[PDB]
């Protein structure tokens, strides 16, 4: 049986909120809740008297309670038994001390492959209240605007980038996910492309019998590291709100290796307490700051 997750007591002197600018987080949530940084001190399991201090992120639910990301409040991992990797489309959520439930991306495990899940600078998921209302979220370290793609060669963002993503909804006490199967060959997957020349985002989060109807981006504008606009699913219009995540990557000398915005996430909101509401997150599969396209067609290098 899945264990009940207890809240973290952040009033402990060993758990200290991190107010540094470097660790500031941003969350998109449908009905409250956010990811928040802490410095946490814990006794060593191995060395007497030794205290171990590390940076952590906790999820603060809409009720104010804090939860860690751990082993039982994540998506089911795909099987490792063949080359094939299939993400199951339905997942149990972990019950909470409050009577709510929680789930977040299974970021942590190796040889899953499945690049959308390999998030390093964000998380996405959902919290359910004891009353069965849900707040879906995507939050993380925002992509600094000064190191977005193209800024180093033009002074502003330019070109295009394509992201490999997963969508999450909550249906009937379970988390349900968009179709994803890999074998960088992808049998089924969901892709979003940002055109920084035109400031547009396009793409489709692919549905199935569990997730429900696909979510098609319709008119989404991109301003700096944030975006917003409309999407459709089954005839219903939802409001898209999201952003680009992850700092830039540098070579040892300080030279830019990859721009900021290597991850992406957000929410799609079809109405207060709508079961269609979604969060999503994923990773940058490809980018080209020099692309002069004016459309949101995907980049498709092998």
235 φ/ψ angles, rounded to the nearest 5 degrees: 90, -10
Buried b (16+ CB within 10 A) or exposed e, 213-236: ebbbbeebebeebbbbbebbbeee
Q: For residue 210, how many C-alpha atoms fall within 13 Å in the half-sphere facing its CB?
A: 18
Dihedral (C-alpha) 184, 71, 170, 89: value to the nearest 10 degrees?
40
* Distance, CA of 283 to CA of 150 (rounded, Å): 18
Which residue in 225, 156, 195 sits closest to 295, CA to CA?
Answer: 195
Structure solved via: X-ray
CA of residue 201 relative to chain centroid, distance: 16
Beta bridge partners of 190: 165
Count of alpha carbons within 13 angstroms of residue 224, beta-carbon side: 6
Burial class (CB in 10 A: 0-12, 13-18, 19+), 11: exposed
CA dihedral 102, 76, 122, 216 (to 10 degrees): -90
Q: Please state, in angstroms and rounded to a whole number, the distance separating the CA atoms of residues 69 and 122.
A: 12
Scanning the chain, the segments in alpha helix (DSSP H) are 151-154
CA distance 286 to 300: 8
∠ CA 138-175-1, rounded to 5°: 120
Q: Where are the beta strands (DSSP E) in 77-224?
A: 85-86, 90-92, 94-95, 101-104, 122-128, 134-140, 160-171, 174-177, 181-182, 186-188, 190-195, 200-205, 215-223
DSSP 46-95: SSTT-EEEEEEEEEEPTTS-EE---SSSBPPPPP-SSS-EE--SEEEPEE
Q: Are 84 and 133 in contact (CB under 8 A)?
A: no
Q: Report resolution in angstroms.
A: 1.6
Separation between Cα atoms, residue 266 and residue 282, nearest integer Å: 10
Is-contact 77 106, C-beta < 8 A? yes
Decide the pairing of beta strands 236-245 and 85-86: unpaired
DSSP-based three-state secondary structure for 199:
coil
CB 122 within 8 A of CB 138: yes
Q: Where is 296: in which H helix or E strand?
A: none
Cα(149)–Cα(174) distance, integer angstroms: 37
Please tell me the distance from the alpha carbon of residue 53 to that of residue 39, in angstroms, as a whole number: 7
| Dist. CA 176–CA 125, nearest whole Å | 11
Q: Which two tokens stand for residue 251?
A: 């070579």
With a CB cutoff of 8 Å and minimum separation 6, the contacts of 119 are 105, 107, 140, 263, 281, 282, 283
Among the listed residues 284, 291, 201, the one whose alpha carbon sits nearest the alpha carbon of residue 249: 284
Contact, 207 vs 222, CB < 8 A?
A: no
Rounded CA separation 57/258 (Å): 24
User: Which tokens belong to 203?
Assistant: 């793409």
Asked if 289 and 193 touch (Cβ cutoff 8 Å), the reply is no
Residue 53: other Cβ atoms inside 10 A: 10
For the chain, the first-to-last Cα distance in angstroms comes to 43
How long is the chain? Answer: 302
């Amino acid at each position: 049986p899945i264990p009940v997750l207890r809240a973290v007591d952040t009033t402990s002197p060993n758990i200290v909120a991190d107010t540094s600018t470097d660790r500031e987080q941003r969350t998109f949530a449908t009905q409250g809740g956010s990811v928040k940084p802490f410095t946490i001190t814990k006794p060593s399991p191995y060395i007497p008297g030794l205290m171990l201090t590390n940076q952590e992120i906790l999820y603060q639910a809409p009720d104010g309670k804090y939860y860690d990301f751990g082993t039982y409040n994540t998506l089911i991992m795909p099987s490792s038994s063949t080359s094939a990797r299939v993400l199951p489309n339905s997942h149990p959520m972990q019950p909470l001390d409050s009577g709510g439930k929680m789930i977040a991306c299974c970021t942590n495990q190796t040889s899953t492959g499945m690049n959308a899940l390999r998030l390093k600078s964000m998380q996405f998921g959902a919290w359910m209240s004891p009353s069965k209302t849900v707040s879906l979220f995507a939050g993380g370290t925002p992509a600094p605007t000064d190191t977005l793609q193209g800024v180093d060669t033009a002074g502003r963002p330019t070109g295009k980038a394509t992201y490999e993503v997963i969508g999450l909804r909550v249906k009937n006490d379970r988390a349900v996910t968009s179709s994803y199967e890999t074998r960088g060959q992808v049998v089924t997957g969901s892709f979003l492309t940002v055109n920084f020349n035109t400031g547009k985002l396009g793409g489709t989060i692919v549905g199935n019998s569990e997730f429900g109807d696909s979510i098609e981006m319709r008119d989404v504008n991109v301003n700096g590291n944030q975006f917003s606009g409309t999407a459709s699913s089954g005839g219903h219009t939802g409001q898209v709100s999201g952003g680009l995540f992850a700092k830039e990557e540098r070579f040892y000398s300080g030279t830019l290796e990859h721009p900021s915005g290597g991850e992406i996430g957000g929410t799609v909101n079809f109405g207060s307490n709508s079961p269609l509401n979604a969060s999503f997150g994923g990773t940058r599969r490809e980018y080209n700051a020099a692309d002069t396209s004016t459309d949101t067609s995907h980049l498709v290098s092998p």
